[PDB]
Every structure is written in C-alpha cells, then in structure tokens.
Amino acid sequence: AAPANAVTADDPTAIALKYNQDATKSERVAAARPGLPPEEQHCANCQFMQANVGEGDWKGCQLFPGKLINVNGWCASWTLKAG
Numbered sequence: 777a778a779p780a781n782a783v784t785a786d787d788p789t790a791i792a793l794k795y796n797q798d799a800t801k802s803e804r805v806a807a808a809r810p811g812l813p814p815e816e817q818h819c820a821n822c823q824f825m826q827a828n829v830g831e832g833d834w835k836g837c838q839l840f841p842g843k844l845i846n847v848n849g850w851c852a853s854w855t856l857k858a859g
C-alpha cells in the first residue's frame with residue numbers, strides 16, 4: 777500500500793513526466809533516456825532519489841517535494857545516480 781503522500785497517477789507533474797511507481801508498467805523503453813539501457817532504469821538508481829527521505833521502498837524524489845516515490849518506479853526525468 778502506498779503512503780499517504782505517495783506520488784499518484786493523478787498528479788499533474790506525474791502525468792507530465794510519465795511517472796509510475798512500478799517501472800515495469802512504465803514507458804522507459806520508449807523514452808530511451810541516456811545513462812543506462814532503459815530496462816535497467818528505476819528510481820533507486822536515479823540522481824533525484826533522496827535516500828534520507830521516507831522509509832523502506834518509499835523514498836523522496838527531489839522533483840516531487842512533499843511526496844514519496846517508490847524505489848522500483850520510474851519517470852521520464854530519470855537520470856543516472858552519479859553522486
């Protein structure tokens with residue numbers, strides 16, 4: 777079950793970025809964002825994932841202030857976690 781502050785499918789920014797909390801139900805292949813082959817991309821390996829926000833599988837994303845994403849999710853702003 778998602779936390780009360782999870783990013784939802786109805787969030788305008790989530791719609792614009794094609795977020796899904798389950799990357800296997802995402803359009804990561806179509807987007808072909810650079811840095812890793814698309815099938816390998818999810819929030820856990822994204823630069824915008826905030827490891828010190830949230831709990832368990834529900835973590836922060838810098839792009840979604842006040843909310844939580846799932847580490848197994850994806851959106852079109854996916855960017856390799858480089859530091």
Ligand code: SF4
Pocket residue numbers: 795818819820822823824825836837838839845849850851852853854855
């Ligand atoms: S920017 Fe990165 S951490 Fe945030 S929802 Fe998109 S893929 Fe997940």
